[PDB]
């Protein structure tokens, strides 16, 4: 099991649409304890995004339907999906805490993995109750904030990762904390700082930075009303 072998496996898995495999491959790769390359890193993240992304979508479907006598079936099912979603997120957080974040040597990746830790705790927050929920919401924000402090020290305002952090962190406020004024504030700031440094935009990724900028604008102009 070369690292090269595992990566081909994952690239195939991806091609085949078996994302539990693609994730298991990258989780294997990650457990060899070397800093992931950018590509290695980007697969793990895509793999896991699709894995959990299917339970999130499924959960929503089952919760939409729940909102129609012996409905304790919707509930017993929801909780199965939820239990499963919690295990995927704990995988990724164990990985982030044990390997990705400590093995991270450089701004671009330190932020990326802290954003991801924010994401996954946010995902847990969607299905969490009581004490658990307060701990989740709070570790989500705490990870988002640490990535942002570092992105502000170390990256252009136009950096896709940094823009992508602002985007996710803004939604964290809107959807999870239910603080829209803050979601907007956090987003106008991130937008305005990017549109100031327009000369910094590199043609070499201009379309990505400008993509996420339009995403940011989207949410604002929706969110104002």
């Amino acid at each position: 099991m070369d690292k090269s072998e595992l990566v081909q496996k994952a690239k195939l898995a991806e091609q085949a649409e078996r994302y539990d495999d693609m994730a298991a491959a990258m989780k294997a790769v990650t457990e060899q304890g070397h800093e992931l390359s950018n590509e290695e890193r980007n697969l793990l993240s895509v793999a896991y995004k699709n894995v959990v992304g299917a339970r999130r979508s499924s959960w929503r479907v089952i919760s939409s339907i729940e909102q129609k006598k012996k409905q304790q079936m919707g509930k017993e099912y929801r909780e199965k999906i939820e239990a499963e979603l919690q295990d995927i997120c704990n995988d990724v957080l164990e990985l982030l805490d044990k390997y990705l974040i400590p093995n991270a040597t450089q701004p671009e990746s330190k932020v990326f993995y802290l954003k991801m830790k924010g994401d996954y705790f946010r995902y847990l927050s969607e299905v969490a109750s009581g004490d658990n929920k307060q701990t989740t919401v709070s570790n989500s924000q705490q990870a988002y904030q640490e990535a942002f402090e570092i992105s502000k020290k170390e990256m252009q305002p136009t950096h896709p990762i940094r823009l992508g952090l602002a985007l996710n962190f803004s939604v964290f406020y809107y959807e999870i904390l239910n603080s829209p004024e803050k979601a907007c504030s956090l987003a106008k700031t991130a937008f305005d700082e990017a549109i100031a440094e327009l000369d910094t935009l590199n043609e070499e990724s201009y379309k990505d930075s400008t993509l996420i900028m339009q995403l940011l604008r989207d949410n604002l102009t929706l969110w104002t009303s």
């Binding site: 995004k49 954003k115 896709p160 990762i161 992508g164 996710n168 803004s170 996420i212 995403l215």
Partner: peptide, 11 residues
């Protein structure tokens, strides 16, 4: 793909 890898909370 970086954009894909960044699972954007989306548009």
């Amino acid at each position: 793909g970086l954009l894909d890898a960044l699972d954007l909370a989306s548009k």
